[PDB]
Amino acid sequence: GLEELLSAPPPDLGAQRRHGWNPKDCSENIEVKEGGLYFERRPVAQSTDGARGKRGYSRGLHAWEISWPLEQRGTHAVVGVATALAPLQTDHYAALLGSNSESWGWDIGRGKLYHQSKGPGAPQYPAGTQGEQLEVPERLLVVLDMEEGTLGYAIGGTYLGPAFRGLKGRTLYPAVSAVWGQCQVRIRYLGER
């Protein structure tokens, strides 16, 4: 149902606010704007800072668009999901999303996948690519299939395959982790099938 989901009328701003960033579930260094549509990270030194969406998904196929300007990524820009227990702030620059049992992320600068990972040993996504041969553009789609229990991504039309599996049974929230002063990251929920 992904083709259909992506072809349907885009959710209006009220829907986007309902599924957008949660001012009550983000780093103390993040400011959520326009009722959830985007956030801005304050320029705190030696800090990685995350946000969760307001809604957690345990069933169905969900998709949302992340907008993350290329000049506002810095050393560690990670896009993915989290349980409600994943830490959203740490006092150093790192791939915080995906550093534990509670979170799954794609490093949109390096191409690596993180789950229970400190970085070393992380695989590349899409399969068989090298990070330095790709550039993740400003807009990417995040595709969470909680019927199959997969997370994957789509770019400029197009689904890149499952990145993570084994997610069925959990309740998972849109998430990112960021290190860049003043970065502005939009989440646009596209809906559920």
Partner 1 sequence: RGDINNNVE
Q: Which residues of the chain form contacts with partner 1 (CB under 8 A)?
A: 43-47, 72, 74-75, 93, 179-183
- Taking the C-alpha atoms of residue 56 and residue 97, their distance in angstroms, rounded to an integer, is 16
Closer to partner 1 by Cβ: residue 183 or 187:
183
Question: For tokens 């989290």, what's the residue?
Answer: 82
- Nearest distance, CB of residue 60 and partner 1, angstroms: 36
**C-alpha dihedral, 49 to 123 to 57 to 167, nearest 10°:** -130
Structure-block tokens of residue 138: 């400003």
- Taking the C-alpha atoms of residue 78 and residue 107, their distance in angstroms, rounded to an integer, is 4
- Nearest distance, CB of residue 159 and partner 1, angstroms: 31
- Nearest distance, CB of residue 46 and partner 1, angstroms: 7
Closer to partner 1 by Cβ: residue 92 or 193:
92
Buried b (16+ CB within 10 A) or exposed e, 140-151: bbbbbbbeebbb
- Nearest distance, CB of residue 71 and partner 1, angstroms: 9
Give the three-class secondary structure for 111. coil
Closer to partner 1 by Cβ: residue 96 or 151:
96
Phi, psi of 56 (to 5 degrees): -105, 140
- Nearest distance, CB of residue 181 and partner 1, angstroms: 3
- Nearest distance, CB of residue 12 and partner 1, angstroms: 33
Distance of CA 89 to the CA centre of its chain: 15
Closer to partner 1 by Cβ: residue 88 or 141:
88
DSSP class of residue 4 equals H
Q: Of the candidates 124, 89, 91, 93, which has an alpha carbon nearest to the alpha carbon of residue 110?
A: 124
Closer to partner 1 by Cβ: residue 49 or 145:
49
Closer to partner 1 by Cβ: residue 74 or 162:
74
